[PDB]
Design a protein around this ligand. Structure first.
Ligand SMILES: *C[C@@](*)(O)[C@H](CCCNC(N)=[NH2+])NC(=O)CNC(=O)[C@@H](N)CCC(=O)O
Ligand SMILES: *C[C@@](*)(O)[C@H](CCCNC(N)=[NH2+])NC(=O)CNC(=O)[C@@H](N)CCC(=O)O
Ligand SMILES: *C[C@@](*)(O)[C@H](CCCNC(N)=[NH2+])NC(=O)CNC(=O)[C@@H](N)CCC(=O)O
Ligand SMILES: *C[C@@](*)(O)[C@H](CCCNC(N)=[NH2+])NC(=O)CNC(=O)[C@@H](N)CCC(=O)O
Ligand SMILES: [Ca+2]
Ligand SMILES: [Ca+2]
Ligand SMILES: [Ca+2]
Lengths: 242, 216, 217, 243, 242, 244, 219, 216
């Protein structure tokens, strides 16, 4: 998380951390608990290549990584079939947990939006994660979960910004309709934040607007962070998730 | 409970032969959750194949796994002498306790008929100090396992006095060794003189008798 | 180089509780699951239960009532406790790892322990009596009779590991006495006798007995 | 270059090395002299972001990097407008040199193919460059130009291979029609080879069939190298480059 | 710490972790609380070059690094005058804290030995630290304090081992009289453990026998760990420390 | 080499490059041809630990590394017995080549000094090598041999400088009598230059004054380059290398 | 890592045998290659070698009639042995000294597979396979692999299927100047007349593959 | 050559300690002494180099010792696979004074096994092509040392037969040998009984195998 502060213990109970085997079960991506048996993450975290599930574990909402770990096994990885790369689109995946989580005050699910939800600018949105604090800058120990309020930008506005200082033709779409834009040069998500949620307050309820997907660098001029528009893939998500 | 059926329960095949062991269930396997184990006598089972068809690293390519749902197969394209073991399949039907093992399949090597080397051992003077005595007949390196050892004490046939034990098939020459131990009291051992074990095997044209005279 | 080790009493009196521990040498197992399997003598593999990556216990159909599996992260250990044991519990106990950290799996037990024999008996441990099987031109056979011990196992080597070829340690036989007897034989050239010294090295771990016996013609 | 040997002094006279300022003018991509005033390269080498020309120089065919350098300035960078990423496609660019090259025996142009040319399997093809010798393995000093004969694979065959051990739906195309496949687990191009040429002998003449573009890893199972199909962009090249 | 396990919360209350400014106050050496106003460490940690005290803090005994940190300022660095390099010797230093620590059950001082103490082989000795787990292998998160029981080796035996597979003349002393040897190929201290304590139980009391100094590699054949012999420098320590 | 320029093709014919096996025979130290069968280097390059000779080759004077290599095998490594570390001293070693080099105009030996030679300040000295151009800064391709004129500093003066901004007691000697000081913040040797020569012109002849040994950083304030004083070890060198 | 010897298997006397030692997907720049030969049934003999610095060293014998070289561009080493006699008929090996010595023998880490060079005025020939027909318990039968040139001949039974009891003997040079061998197998007498035996002889130098079907007779 | 290996050949049982010595009159240059293992029909393998350094992957049962003029290869516990010819090789200078040792053939020791003598008459196709080749097979025996004689109508033949011997098998450690008497079909067609007489250590009274001529 570029910009923003350390999240309070209470906030973001749906926040998960994806772990990879090695000298330790290291953090590499985030995700959200959308059901007691399901995690919503980015496809680029777990694909396009088929991954050995022995090399993956999920960690539920805790303040700091590695200090109070209880690693959960994954039974299935479901990557959107239309996914190849983040810039192409369909950067969304589901993880089915081997065991259902016992929901509580500190650990519970995030609400997905209705299809009709557009998430226009002005919307109070927040992105959360344990990823990079700046470009090629890791989150230092004790690894606190970080949060940042990010401004929503319209797709065409964002798409126009992405063309500034680029050879790509103006008629050539960069920011695709399954994507959403948020951030500026001070507030943004970064590498290690992927799969993590972009949540917005809509009539007193937190709805996951997006999934941390990609962007050119981290909090770069005319390069807002790009997210997978959750509304676009609702039908796919709900084919698996109750 | 237990609900997985392996077929056959035991098989015998020659070196280089293609071997097929099938594993069957009534409920379908959860998520390709079917693995194959090889258990060599007095050793922990070894994982050869996992998730139906994936081969454990280092395991020879002669081992392959196939199948889906309710019917699975372990294949040994060219059976080797070392491949002698009990093979068990194991599956998962759910993620909360419905997992079992198959009954197992004992794979045994077939080779040319080999005749045993018969030996006789009189009870030790150390043991004769105590009340008991033990006469040992050895049958060394033969094929097949089937063989009959008879005890003749002054030519009289013996019953219920002996106990035999077979070695597990050799990893290299694929033969067996058998020991027949006659147990007698010191009082009865002194009552007789001619102790012999008559061996009748397939690899012997006529029964081999090995004996000794007491007090030599 | 990765090893799982089962530890615990070899002999348990009936009605009591067997307690076994599965330890992991020079390797951590935080994201993994350990399951316990048993194998009655001459019978096949049976699942007892297991503990998941998230410390969740799963027990088989039988056992549910009388079995407890736990983790001591501080000790890098897994426990198995089987209460009110009978001779039906006499088996070889194995602990194995599911690298996916499942807890109720059996289809991908990659690492296994060496196995530990647990004998459920009211009988007391007895050390063996080793007797020579004395040799008789060409080939010659010689051995050791390891009589009247309890419980299993007994390990027999020759010349302290040096003689391995032609060695045949037979499986043990349960006698009328309720004690085991066993023989270890070896074939050598008749020419080598009197020139070479043959000693069998009998080891009964249940009674902490080690006997070395020199076989002579 | 993964697999293959060091090129003879004679061979590949159209081969160029793209340089970037720093403690030295370091090699970062390859390219081909297609005209005395033009070099053909991959767009990902010089894009999609606009680059300062002060930070770029071209080096003509020489056996080793840095030993006998004569760095040439670039006057213009022309990246295909349809280019964003290599996997999306249109990974092609042109560099206009500030001064024309006087062509010789050791330094001359490569022939571009006719549009009708398909480059089917069996074709004797070679790829050349100063890039990585294996995955995350740099070309060691004295930096010789390397060459490797690579087998051409049909797009649908290659696309099928790309789907093996991938979650991507079979109906979802990976190897696009503006792309070409070549290589195996022993012979391939790698990072630092980009923009460099894939040339094939067609009726006794060397024609540039492709431009080194992308691929999953370097010489990986079921992952042949992906090149830009030069035929696809002939009309665009010739809008700038004299016929 | 090469080999050995994670220390219990109770054990080693004198253990300190030296910190250096940067993206975070990162651990770089260990040391021991020998007085409520003094820390005993290795000179190579803080020398021979003069260090800016703004760049240094001391962290008292805690189980894991960075989770419950309360950084203490240092007012003075006293490096032994005879120190230039670890192999030359006199690799010992004192840090005077700006404020005295309030001693407790979890945080208290280590006893220094009498001069007469020799620390012969057989002695039950332990070395503790947050340093490398193996050669060029850092202690992974959550950074637990590690402990290992190390075997004491006599100086001449150790010096003879140090000459095996070395061109250095046998008459040329490597292990000096101000040094102490402990460890094998399975149990040893490593980089990041420097300054930390080597304590031995002598008649029911823990005495700091040595200070983590140097060695060729970490737990290498015929290369036991070399510690500064605390007895050798008692007079110097007690010139400053009450 | 920190500061200084690229050496002309003619200059420093005694300069050798020590190589180590790997993806290529990479440069790691320097040395000097002191006899057609012997090369003089620093001990820390090849010690104190025993090294496999399969992993070492010597490359004679060439302008750039790797471009025109002819790697020569080594038959013996002789490290001074008193050597453990550079700061302790005796950082000197000899490599016996498996084959004698055919000396020429571009490849020939350096003269060793008489024992009486002191090498006082003022002398015109030069250090040469293919090592680091600055602290943690490698010599970039095409890897030219570099040269730098370095000023000689007296041992006590140098020792005093080494104590400035150091806790080490003034009575505690840092620059030892078997060592020599040369360099400033603009001109100096660096990592990879080790074993290379420090040559000075004495009555119209180039004599190897020193062997690149160590130093705190590269061209750092009050930290001149420390070299092994060749005079100190002449008797040891000549126990193995023919006098002539 | 592999070293490969290449060259003519058959050389006529008075001529010059030219061999090449190739190196696959490995550097070899700082190394030395030495050539060794081994007469049939005899021991190892050093021919000569080339150093890391391209320096040649030749053995006591050979010096006069031997030439070793390097083609760095081809990653090849050559061996040229002039005025060859039947005394030069041996297995030629090229080996690497990892110290790049040239005249060493004590540390030849990598070796080639070996190449047989036969010095003869004789021409190439396929073998003639004849059955060694069997004959109450165990029966013996085989194949006679007569008159061929040069070595080797590979004998398998039932196209690899029968391996146990198989004994293929070493080849013998006859008066004719043509080699010959046999291959024997023990089988149960019960299996004869139900099991068809086929010995599959293969002479790679002439590309010949003969399958002789061994069957019983009457006297 | 100045490298004396002792013995030239040795026979030892499995598990036995084996010592092969290499000695020279001139002292070795710079610990320049290596040990090679050559298995039949294979290139020599470097096991030990620079006197005592073990090649990576080579079992720890192989060790090298010595200096100057006397060196030793040791096989602490001889394995069946260890049968081969071991050669030492040393350097005395850097310019050509290097040789190999004459080699030592190491052979695995087993119990005396009498041969099985089989006579094979010339095939009819070979007789149709004008040649008579008689084969006297000797099968699976220990030791290799055996005597074969060819009697034609009781008349002892000379220098018309050619023997050939296989190597030591790692399964039973025995050998087999082929005596082959060759003559023309015209020389064949003038004699009745073709006999092969075999004399071995396992043969108390020799074994003669004979047949009467033709395709009867
Ligand atoms: C996979 C996930 O951890 C990252 C983070 C997304 C970056 N977010 C913002 N706001 N800038 N996703 C990726 O790295 C996907 N690929 C890209 O972002 C590339 N365009 C650049 C990758 C890079 O600079 O490392
Ligand atoms: C830009 C140029 O240096 C390389 C070379 C192409 C790789 N060639 C083959 N045959 N694989 N082009 C790229 O690196 C373009 N991007 C990619 O290949 C990515 N898919 C991954 C890069 C990686 O794995 O390092
Ligand atoms: C200063 C402190 O972190 C280390 C740790 C001591 C190493 N302990 C054992 N048992 N080896 N001290 C040093 O790094 C002092 N310098 C050295 O030890 C060097 N001889 C080795 C340097 C290295 O390999 O990193
Ligand atoms: C071994 C050789 O290549 C180097 C170069 C000498 C450095 N020269 C000058 N003038 N500073 N020798 C060493 O690296 C010996 N060790 C040291 O100098 C250490 N005191 C520090 C090494 C460092 O700063 O990285
Ligand atoms: Ca970046
Ligand atoms: Ca890569
Ligand atoms: Ca430095």
């Amino acid at each position: 998380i570029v910009g923003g502060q350390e999240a309070p213990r209470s906030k973001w109970p749906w926040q998960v951390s994806l772990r990879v085997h090695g000298p330790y079960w290291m953090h590499f991506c985030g995700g959200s608990l959308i059901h007691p048996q399901w995690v919503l993450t980015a496809a680029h975290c777990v694909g396009p290549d088929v991954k050995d599930l022995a090399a993956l574990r999920v960690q539920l909402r805790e303040q700091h990584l590695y200090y109070q770990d209880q690693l959960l096994p994954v039974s299935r990885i479901i990557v959107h079939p239309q996914f190849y790369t983040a810039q192409i689109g369909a950067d969304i995946a589901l993880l089915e947990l081997e065991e259902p989580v016992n929901v509580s005050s500190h650990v519970h699910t995030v609400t997905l939006p209705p299809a009709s939800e557009t998430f226009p600018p002005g919307m109070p949105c927040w992105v959360t994660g344990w990823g990079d604090v700046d470009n090629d800058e890791r989150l230092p120990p004790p690894f606190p979960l970080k949060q940042v309020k990010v401004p929503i930008m319209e797709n065409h506005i964002c798409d126009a910004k992405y063309h500034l200082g680029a050879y790509t033709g103006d008629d050539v779409r960069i920011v695709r309709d399954d994507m959403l834009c948020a951030g500026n040069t001070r507030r943004d998500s970064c590498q290690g934040d992927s799969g993590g949620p972009l949540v917005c307050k809509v009539n007193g309820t937190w709805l996951q607007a997006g999934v941390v997907s990609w962007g050119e660098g981290c909090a770069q001029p005319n390069r807002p962070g790009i997210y997978t528009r959750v509304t676009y893939y609702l039908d796919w998500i709900h084919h698996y998730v109750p | 409970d237990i609900q997985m059926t392996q077929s056959p329960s035991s098989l015998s095949a020659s070196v280089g032969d293609r071997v097929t062991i099938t594993c069957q269930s009534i409920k379908s396997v959860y998520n390709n959750r079917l693995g194959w184990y090889q258990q060599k006598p007095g050793k922990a089972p070894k994982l050869l194949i996992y998730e139906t068809s994936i081969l454990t690293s280092g395991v020879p390519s002669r081992f392959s796994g196939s199948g889906s749902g309710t019917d699975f197969t372990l294949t040994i394209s060219s059976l080797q002498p070392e491949d002698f073991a009990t093979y068990y399949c194991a599956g998962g039907f759910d993620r909360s306790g419905d997992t079992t093992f198959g009954q197992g399949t004992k794979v045994e090597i077939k080779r040319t008929v080999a005749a045993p080397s018969v030996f006789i051992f009189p009870p030790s003077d150390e043991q004769l100090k105590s009340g008991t005595a033990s006469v040992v007949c050895l049958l060394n390196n033969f094929y097949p396992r089937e063989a009959k050892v008879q005890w003749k004490v002054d030519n009289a046939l013996q019953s219920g006095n002996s106990q035999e034990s077979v070695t597990e098939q050799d990893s290299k020459d694929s033969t067996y060794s058998l020991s027949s131990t006659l147990t007698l009291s010191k009082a009865d051992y002194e009552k007789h003189k001619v102790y012999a074990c008559e061996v009748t095997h397939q690899g012997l044209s006529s029964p081999v008798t090995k004996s000794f005279n007491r007090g030599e | 180089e990765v090893q799982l080790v089962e530890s615990g009493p070899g002999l348990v009196k009936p009605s009591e509780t067997l307690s076994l521990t599965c330890t992991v040498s020079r390797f951590s197992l935080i994201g993994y699951a350990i399951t316990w399997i048993r194998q009655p003598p001459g019978k096949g593999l049976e699942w007892i239960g297991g503990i998941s990556s998230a410390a969740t216990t799963f027990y088989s159909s039988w056992a549910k009532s009388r079995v407890t599996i736990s983790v001591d992260t501080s000790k890098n250990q897994f426990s198995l406790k089987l209460s009110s044991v009978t001779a039906a519990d006499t088996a070889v106990y194995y602990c194995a790892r599911d690298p996916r950290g499942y807890g109720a799996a059996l289809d991908r037990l990659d690492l296994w322990g060496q196995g530990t024999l647990v004998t459920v008996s009211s009988a007391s441990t007895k050390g063996p009596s080793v007797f020579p099987l004395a040799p008789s031109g060409g080939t010659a056979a010689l051995g050791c009779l390891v009589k009247d011990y309890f419980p299993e196992p007994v390990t027999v080597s020759w010349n302290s590991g040096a003689l391995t070829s032609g060695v045949h340690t037979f499986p043990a036989v349960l006698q009328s006495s309720g004690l085991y007897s066993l023989s270890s034989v070896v074939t050598v050239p008749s020419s080598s006798l009197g020139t070479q010294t043959y000693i069998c090295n009998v080891n009964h771990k249940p009674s902490n007995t080690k006997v070395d016996k020199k076989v002579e013609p």
